[PDB]
């Protein structure tokens, strides 16, 4: 019959191969990947290319990104690096709107007064065109 409309939610579910973003710790902001599952609350991760060590971390210090890839349960560091390089994760991440906003925050924080002034004069010119255009 007519398609039974059923929608509730589609999650970033935790599983092997999932990429995570660490938000608190020595390795915050640096990416990693889940290898296997310790328990309901915590997991272990390994980010070799990002410089992360093989850890065992709670799920409060991480964030589950959408992107993911496929690797076997319990994989080792050299295997993880291989599969990461294969699936090209650090380019699929940088292309997101999330990562663009992160880099934007970092840039905006790393700015100096001269550049802050440059931005003011660059925005004056921009809204000048926009406000000549929208009337």
């Amino acid at each position: 019959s007519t398609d039974s409309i059923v929608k509730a939610s589609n999650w970033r579910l935790v599983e092997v191969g999932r990429v995570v973003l660490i938000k608190k710790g020595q390795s915050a902001g640096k990416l990693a990947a889940i290898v296997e599952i310790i328990d309901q609350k915590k997991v272990l991760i390994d980010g070799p290319k990002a410089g992360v060590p093989r850890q065992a971390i709670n799920l409060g210090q991480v964030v589950l990104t959408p992107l993911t890839f496929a690797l076997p349960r319990g994989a080792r560091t050299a295997t993880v690096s291989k599969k990461w390089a294969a699936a090209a994760v650090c380019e699929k991440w940088a292309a997101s709107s999330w990562a663009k906003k992160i880099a934007q925050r970092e840039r905006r924080a790393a700015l100096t007064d001269f550049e802050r002034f440059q931005v003011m004069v660059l925005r004056k010119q921009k809204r000048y065109t926009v406000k000549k255009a929208l009337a």
Binding site: S9, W11, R12, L13, V14, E15, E36, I37, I38, D39, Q40, L44, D46, R54, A56, L59, L64, G74
Partner: protein, 171 residues
């Protein structure tokens, strides 16, 4: 606490009648050498005729884990004293290290039985090798194939007290 594992060798003090007595060994969980050496003389003084004064400690060595980046199923045989009577228990844990399994065993024991460190004796810790001797469901439910699950209700932390948009719990 932040536990550690120690290897304590001890020796009743030598005499002319027996100037090479028997070395007894214990593999103890504790936060530091001091209380490790205290617990050694607590357990040895339950089994053999010796004390700190009538004995000495030969070697005390930290045991680090061989494969701390490996998930393991630690079976644990323990005994604890309750308010009325003394009992034994077996519990399985799924942590990567012996010491971490102990750290989370003391905790959930104190939760579910209100038993303190001063009541518990850890008899045996065994890394189970195969996924067929596990008998506890709260472990077996993580030994499934293609295990995946979500975290439905997310709560973002806040450094500011006033926020100008209702939050979303979507993950």
């Amino acid at each position: 606490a932040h536990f550690k594992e120690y290897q304590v060798i001890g020796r009743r003090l030598p005499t002319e009648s027996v100037p090479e007595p028997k070395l007894f060994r214990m593999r103890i969980f504790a936060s530091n050498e001091v209380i490790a050496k205290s617990r050694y003389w607590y357990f040895l003084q339950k089994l053999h005729k010796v004390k700190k004064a009538s004995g000495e400690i030969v070697s005390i060595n930290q045991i680090n884990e061989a494969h701390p980046t490996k998930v393991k199923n630690f079976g644990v045989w323990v005994r604890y004293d309750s308010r009325s009577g003394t009992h034994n228990m077996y519990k399985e844990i799924r942590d990567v290290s012996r010491v971490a399994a102990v750290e989370t065993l003391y905790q959930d024991m104190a939760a579910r039985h209100r038993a303190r460190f001063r009541s518990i004796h850890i008899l045996k810790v065994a890394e189970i090798e195969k996924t067929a001797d596990v008998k506890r469901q709260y472990v077996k439910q993580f030994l499934t194939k293609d295990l995946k699950f979500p975290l439905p209700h997310r709560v973002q932390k806040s450094t500011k007290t006033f926020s100008y948009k209702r939050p979303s719990t979507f993950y």
